[PDB]
Design an enzyme around this catalytic site. Structure first.
Site, PDB file in Angstrom:
ATOM      1  N   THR B 175      46.123   4.574  -7.966  1.00  9.53           N
ATOM      2  CA  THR B 175      46.343   4.710  -6.566  1.00  9.53           C
ATOM      3  C   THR B 175      46.403   5.433  -6.617  1.00  9.53           C
ATOM      4  OG1 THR B 175      49.008   4.652  -7.581  1.00  9.53           O
ATOM      5  CG2 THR B 175      47.825   2.388  -7.482  1.00  9.53           C
ATOM      6  N   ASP B 176      46.858   7.112  -6.855  1.00  7.62           N
ATOM      7  CA  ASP B 176      47.045   7.997  -6.333  1.00  7.62           C
ATOM      8  C   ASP B 176      45.027   8.358  -5.155  1.00  7.62           C
ATOM      9  OD1 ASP B 176      48.941   8.903  -7.967  1.00  7.62           O
ATOM     10  OD2 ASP B 176      48.483  10.437  -8.619  1.00  7.62           O
ATOM     11  N   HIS B 177      43.982   7.838  -5.569  1.00  9.76           N
ATOM     12  CA  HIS B 177      42.635   8.368  -5.591  1.00  9.76           C
ATOM     13  C   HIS B 177      42.297   8.571  -3.884  1.00  9.76           C
ATOM     14  CE1 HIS B 177      42.729   9.011 -10.189  1.00  9.76           C
ATOM     15  NE2 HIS B 177      43.275  10.407 -10.020  1.00  9.76           N
TER      16      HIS B 177
END
Lengths: 407, 407
Positions: B175-177
Site C-alpha cells: 500500500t505504501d508504494h
C-alpha cells in the site's frame, strides 16, 4: 467550481478507467467513450446477484460512476469526425487503445490537438506506446509477470499468487491520473498539452519494494516477505488470519511490547520470546527461529478471533491487523465512523449498490461518487448536441452506425 | 538548450521521512520541483539503516538502496525541530513553499505552532498535506500499522492466495508504494490546479486504508451486493481460460499465459503443435475450459516444462496470446524493453559510486521526467538552502549550525 471546468474524455475498458474516475470524483465533466460493442469491463465479474447483463458488472459500476456515456464507432469516417469535434472541446483524453491504432485511423495526437493546443492525451497500455513490447498483447497476469511484481508473491520455489482487482491495471491508472493532472497543470500555464504515456509494466516496477536494489547492490534475488519471524508474518487464528509486525531491523523497543502482550495473556512458552536473539534478522529468518516463533505465537492465535487479536494486540501497542474479508470490511467500525461506504440507488438494477468512498479529503474541494455508471449510449444524443450537432445530423450518425444512442 | 519541466518553480517543504510520503515527493522532484527534505541528524530516516546496502556493507547512513531509491533529486537540510531557533528557519521555508507535507505524530505540528492554522497565515498559497493509517478520529484512529498491515486490513491479502491455503498477500508493503503515493500526488495536483483559479492553498488529507480499498473494490462490493465473501483464486482468473503460471526450463522458471477468447485458444493450440488432446469438446469453449481448468493446466504445464520460456513467450506474443516470463529483479533490470524505454537510470554517488535508480512510470512527450542526482546525505544542502533561498547571512548560518540548530 471544483473540477467542473475540465472536460475529460475517457475511452477505456478493463484497463484504464480508474484514472478518469479520480477526475470525476472531484467534479470534472467526464464522458466515458465506448464502441457500439460495449466496454469489455461490462462483461467481467464479480456480479450483482445472478445478473450477467451489460449493467451487472460491479467493476463497471464502480470505475465508471461519475461519468456520462456515449458510443462512437471510430472505424466509421463519420465517427472519427464526431470524435475530433469532441476532442476540440476537451481538456483531457484518457484512452487505453492498442499502440498505433488511433494513429492508423488518422487520429494521432497532432490531429486531435490541431485546433486545441492545450489538449492532454494520456495513453494507458500494458507496455507503453513505444519500445520492443509495444506491438504485443498483455494482461494483468502477464504484465505482473514481466514487471517483476508477480514473482514477489511467494517464497522459495513456490509459484506466486495474484493480487486481486487487476493491480497491474490499477497501478497504471493511478499513475496515469497523476501524469494527466501534472500535464494539465503544465498546460494551464504554457497553453500546450502533450502526450502522457503510462505503461503497466513500468507502473508495477514501482512496486518491487527494494528487489531491484538488492540485485544492483548485492547480487541478491529476493522474493516475498512472510518468513522473517514476527516481521510481516501472517498467522492463522480461530476465524481467519492476522498480519503482524512486532519487529523490524534491530528495533527492540518494537519487540518489548509484543513480549508483554504474550506475558499478559499467559501464552505458553512466552519466555522463549524474551531473548535478545530475536533482535537479530539472521535468527528471525533462520529455519529454527521462524518455526519456533510460529509454534509459540500460533498456539495463542488459533484460540482467538481476528477481532479479538486486533483489539488486544493494538491495546499493547503492537502492529497487528486482521486479514479482513468482505464481511469484516463492511462491519469495520472505523470505516463506519468515517462514513466511507457510499450507497447509491441504481435504477437500471432496481437496487442499492454500495461502493468504496473517498480516498482523500480536501479543505475546499468535495469528493463525490457522482452519477450511476452510464448505460451503453445513454448520453450519446445530449453530448453530440452539446458539440453543435443537430437532430438530423445525429439521426444520420445513428442510422449509418457511426454512433449508438440508447432507446 | 531550453529544458521544459512540468512543475518548474514549485517548492516542497518535505518533513516526511518514511512510508509513502517520500515516495510521493520523489515523483515531484523528477518533474522539476525543488523538494527540500527536513531531516534531523538525531532522527535519521530509518531506511538509511535498512538493507540492501552497497556490497552488503551497512556502515554509515548513505549506503542503503532502500533509502536511496526513494530520494533521488532531493535536497536535504538538517534541522532539529525541537530546538526553538529551528522553527524560525522552517517558517522561512514554509513562506517560500508551495507544498508542506509531513508524517509527525498527530498534534506535533500544532505543538510547534505549524499546523494548518499557522501555515495558512505564513503562506496562504501553501498546500498542507498529511496522512494517517485510517483517519485521525474514530475508534481505530490511534492504531499502528505498516504497509503489510494495510494490505491485510484493506482486504487485499485475503484475496491474494491459493484457494484453501493460507493467504500470502503481495510479499511486500504494497500500500505504501503506489496506492498511497499516487492518491497523495493526485490530491496535491488537484489543489495546485484549484489554486491557479482561487489563489489559495488548502489542506489535503489521506487515510491510507481508504486509498487502498479504493483500488481493491471487489472484496467489499461483492459482499455488500451478494452477502457472500469473494474468495481468492490463486493465479487463475474468473473469465480467462487457460489462465495461469506454468513451469519452463531452468531454476524457478515460470511463464504466465492468459487466454481470453477462442481465437487466442486456437493460437495457443497452434503454438503447441495442435496436439489432439486440446481438440476435446471439454476445451472448445471458454466455459468448458473454465470447468476443466485443473486438467487443462496440467496438460499445458506438461508441455511448457519442455520449453525455454523466453522462446515460448516470444512465440506466443507473436501469435497474439498474452504471455510473459515470471521475471526476477535481475531480469527486470536487464530487460530490453524497460531499458529502451529509459525506465532504469544509473546515478553516481560520492560514497557508493554508480548505482541503480528508476524514473516514475510516466513518459511525457514535452516535459519529460529527469533523473539528475543521487539521494542526498543528511544536511548535504543545509548551507546552500539557508544562504541561497532563505536569506540568512554567512554569520547567521554559522551561528545556527555552530549552536547545532542545523547541521
Amino acid at each position: 467550481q471544483d473540477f467542473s471546468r475540465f472536460r475529460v474524455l475517457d475511452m477505456t475498458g478493463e484497463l484504464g478507467p480508474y484514472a478518469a474516475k479520480m477526475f470525476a470524483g472531484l467534479g470534472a465533466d467526464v464522458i466515458h467513450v465506448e464502441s457500439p460493442a460495449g466496454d469489455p469491463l461490462r462483461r467481467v465479474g464479480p456480479w450483482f446477484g445472478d445478473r450477467r447483463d451489460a449493467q451487472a458488472s460491479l467493476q463497471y459500476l464502480y470505475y465508471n460512476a461519475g461519468k456520462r456515456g456515449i458510443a462512437v464507432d471510430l472505424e466509421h469516417e463519420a465517427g472519427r469526425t464526431a470524435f475530433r469535434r469532441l476532442c476540440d472541446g476537451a481538456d483531457l483524453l484518457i484512452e487505453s487503445c492498442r499502440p498505433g491504432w488511433l494513429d492508423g485511423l488518422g487520429l494521432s495526437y497532432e490531429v486531435l490537438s490541431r485546433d486545441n493546443a492545450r489538449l492532454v492525451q494520456t495513453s494507458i497500455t500494458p507496455f507503453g506506446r513505444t519500445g520492443p513490447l509495444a506491438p504485443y498483447p498483455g494482461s494483468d497476469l502477464t504484465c505482473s509477470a514481466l514487471s517483476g511484481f508477480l514473482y514477489l508473491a511467494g517464497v522459495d520455489g513456490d509459484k506466486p499468487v495474484r493480487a486481486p482487482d487487476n493491480q497491474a491495471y490499477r497501478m497504471a491508472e493511478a499513475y496515469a491520473a497523476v501524469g494527466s493532472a501534472i500535464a494539465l497543470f503544465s498546460a494551464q500555464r504554457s497553453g500546450r498539452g502533450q502526450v502522457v504515456d503510462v505503461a503497466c509494466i513500468e507502473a508495477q516496477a514501482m512496486a518491487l519494494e527494494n528487489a531491484a536494489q538488492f540485485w544492483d547492490l548485492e547480487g541478491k534475488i529476493r522474493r516475498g516477505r512472510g518468513r522473517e519471524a514476527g516481521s510481516a508474518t501472517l498467522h492463522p487464528c480461530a476465524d481467519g488470519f492476522i498480519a503482524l509486525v512486532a519487529i523490524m531491523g534491530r528495533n527492540k523497543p518494537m519487540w518489548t511490547p509484543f513480549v508483554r502482550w504474550m506475558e499478559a495473556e499467559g501464552v505458553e512458552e512466552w519466555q522463549v520470546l524474551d531473548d535478545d536473539k530475536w533482535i537479530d534478522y539472521a535468527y528471525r529468518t533462520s529455519e529454527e527461529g521462524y518455526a519456533t516463533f510460529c509454534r509459540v505465537f500460533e498456539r495463542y492465535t488459533r484460540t482467538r478471533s481476528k477481532a479479538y487479536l486486533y483489539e488486544i494486540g493494538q491495546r499493547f501497542n503492537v502492529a497487528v491487523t486482521p486479514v479482513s474479508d468482505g464481511r469484516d470490511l463492511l462491519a469495520n467500525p472505523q470505516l463506519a465512523h468515517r462514513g466511507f461506504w457510499q450507497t447509491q440507488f441504481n435504477d437500471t438494477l432496481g437496487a442499492n449498490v454500495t461502493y468504496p468512498g473517498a480516498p482523500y479529503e480536501f479543505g475546499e474541494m468535495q469528493w463525490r461518487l457522482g452519477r450511476n455508471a452510464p448505460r451503453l449510449g445513454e448520453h450519446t444524443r445530449e453530448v453530440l448536441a452539446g458539440c453543435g450537432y443537430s437532430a438530423s445530423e445525429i439521426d444520420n450518425l445513428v442510422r449509418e452506425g457511426a454512433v449508438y444512442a440508447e432507446q | 538548450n531550453s529544458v521544459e519541466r512540468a512543475l518548474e518553480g514549485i517548492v516542497v517543504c518535505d518533513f516526511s521521512w518514511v512510508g509513502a510520503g517520500p515516495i510521493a515527493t520523489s515523483v515531484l522532484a523528477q518533474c522539476g520541483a525543488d523538494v527540500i527534505r527536513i531531516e534531523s541528524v538525531k532522527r535519521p530516516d530509518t531506511l538509511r539503516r535498512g538493507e540492501p546496502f552497497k556490497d552488503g556493507i551497512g556502515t554509515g547512513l548513505d549506503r542503503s538502496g532502500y533509502f536511496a531509491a526513494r530520494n533521488a533529486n532531493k535536497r536535504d537540510i538538517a534541522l532539529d525541530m525541537n530546538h526553538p531557533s529551528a522553527r524560525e528557519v522552517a517558517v522561512r521555508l514554509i513562506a517560500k513553499s508551495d507544498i508542506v507535507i509531513n508524517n509527525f505524530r498527530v498534534g506535533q505540528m500544532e505543538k510547534w505552532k505549524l499546523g494548518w492554522d499557522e501555515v495558512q497565515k505564513i503562506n496562504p498559497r501553501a498546500i498542507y498535506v498529511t496522512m494517517s493509517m485510517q483517519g485521525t478520529d474514530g475508534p481505530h484512529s490511534r492504531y499502528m500499522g505498516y504497509g503489510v498491515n494495510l494490505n491485510a486490513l484493506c482486504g487485499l491479502t485475503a484475496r491474494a492466495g491459493f484457494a484453501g491455503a493460507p493467504p500470502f498477500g503481495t510479499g511486500t508493503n504494497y500500500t505504501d508504494h503506489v496506492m498511497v503515493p499516487t492518491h497523495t500526488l493526485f490530491g496535491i495536483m488537484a489543489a495546485l490546479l484549484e489554486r491557479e483559479v482561487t489563489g489559495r492553498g488548502q489542506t489535503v488529507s489521506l487515510s491510507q486504508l481508504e486509498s487502498a480499498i479504493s483500488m481493491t473494490p471487489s472484496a467489499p462490493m461483492a459482499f455488500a451486493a451478494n452477502g457472500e465473501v469473494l474468495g481468492p483464486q490463486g493465479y487463475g482468473d474468473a473469465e480467462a481460460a487457460p489462465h495461469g503460471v506454468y513451469t519452463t526450463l531452468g531454476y524457478r522458471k515460470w511463464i504466465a499465459i492468459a487466454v481470453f477468447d477462442d481465437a487466442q485458444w486456437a493460437a495457443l493450440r497452434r503454438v503447441m503443435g495442435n496436439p489432439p488432446w486440446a481438440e476435446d469438446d471439454g476445451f472448445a469453449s471458454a466455459e468448458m475450459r473454465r470447468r476443466n481448468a485443473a486438467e487443462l493446466d496440467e496438460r499445458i504445464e506438461a508441455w511448457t516444462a519442455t520449453q525455454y520460456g523466453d522462446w515460448l513467450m516470444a512465440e506466443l506474443l507473436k501469435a497474439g496470446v498474452p504471455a510473459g516470463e515470471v521475471r526476477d529483479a535481475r531480469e527486470a533490470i536487464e530487460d530490453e524493453h524497460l531499458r529502451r524505454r529509459g525506465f532504469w537510470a544509473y546515478l553516481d554517488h560520492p560514497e557508493v559510486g554508480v548505482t541503480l535508480y528508476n524514473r516514475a512510470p510516466i513518459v511525457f512527450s514535452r516535459t519529460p521526467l529527469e533523473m539528475k542526482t543521487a539521494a542526498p546525505s543528511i544536511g548535504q544542502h543545509t548551507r546552500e538552502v539557508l544562504g541561497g533561498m532563505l536569506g540568512y547571512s554567512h554569520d547567521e548560518i554559522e551561528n545556527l549550525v555552530s549552536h547545532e540548530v542545523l547541521v
